A paper describes a structure:
[name], more distantly related to either Bacillus or Listeria, is an ovoid-shaped Gram-positive coccus in which [name] is essential. In [name], [name] localises to mid-cell, the only region of active PG synthesis for both peripheral (side-wall) elongation and cell division in this bacterium. SpGpsB co-immunoprecipitated with SpPBP2a (one of three pneumococcal class A PBPs), SpMreC and other proteins, suggesting they interact at some point in the pneumococcal cell cycle. Whilst the interactions of SpGpsB with SpEzrA and SpStkP were confirmed by BACTH, and observed with the reciprocal hybrid pairs, they were unaffected by any of the SpGpsB alleles mentioned above.
[name] has emerged as a major regulator of PG biosynthesis in low G+C Gram-positive bacteria, and its homologues (DivIVA/Wag31/antigen 84) in Actinobacteria play essential roles in hyphal growth and branching. Therefore, the role of [name] in the bacterial cell cycle is that of an adaptor, docking PG synthases to other cell wall enzymes, scaffolds and shape determinants into protein complexes for division (the divisome) and peripheral growth (the elongasome).
Author numbering:
A (entry chain B): -1 to 0, 4 to 61
B (entry chain A): 0, 4 to 61
C (entry chain C), D (entry chain D): -1 to 0, 4 to 59
Write the structure that this text describes.
Amino acid sequence: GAIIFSAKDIFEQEFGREVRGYNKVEVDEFLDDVIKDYETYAALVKSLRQEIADLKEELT
Amino acid sequence: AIIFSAKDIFEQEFGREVRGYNKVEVDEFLDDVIKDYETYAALVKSLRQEIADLKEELT
Amino acid sequence: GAIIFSAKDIFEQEFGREVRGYNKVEVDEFLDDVIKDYETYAALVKSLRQEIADLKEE
Amino acid sequence: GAIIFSAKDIFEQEFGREVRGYNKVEVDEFLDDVIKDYETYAALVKSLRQEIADLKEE
């Protein structure tokens, strides 16, 4: 299926306030790393598609 | 350079503070993040297979 | 990256030839319409994602 | 209505014969992936429009 979130969306996500909700620093630092993972995967899919496209064109 | 698996997203726990984030909103957000990790993993898997097959065919 | 091609890739796509081939004008002009569908789909996803964002603000 | 073709239209498209025309395997297999993109876009749009109905209901 398609990807729900961009790395932009991950970063822009705001959460409402809740008394005794999750520690904001823990969630924020966690999503900081999740952002890096979205960027890596998005770039990895692009390079793989580019490799396929080059190989198909080679095959031609 | 991948830091997390979907397993790690699911297993991630957080402390609480008085001015915290709404826990349902976070958990419901991370449930979709898990879906995205697994979609990416499966998409990468299938692409690396298409690449291996094309390389076989180029020989 | 669940979408394989951009509209640019459709535009750039080249084919070799064979003896019992497909008519080049027919394929070409068909892909010129596929190109429009890719552009339309990309702009519709972009407009819908904007409606979703705005809705989160309200 | 602004989409010209359905994924099923892409599949059903026939091209006439041209001697030394385009390689059928290359065109067919290209269009197989175009099909997957029409299916993906159509699923995606539906899914975005559902989320919109969801946020309005909420």
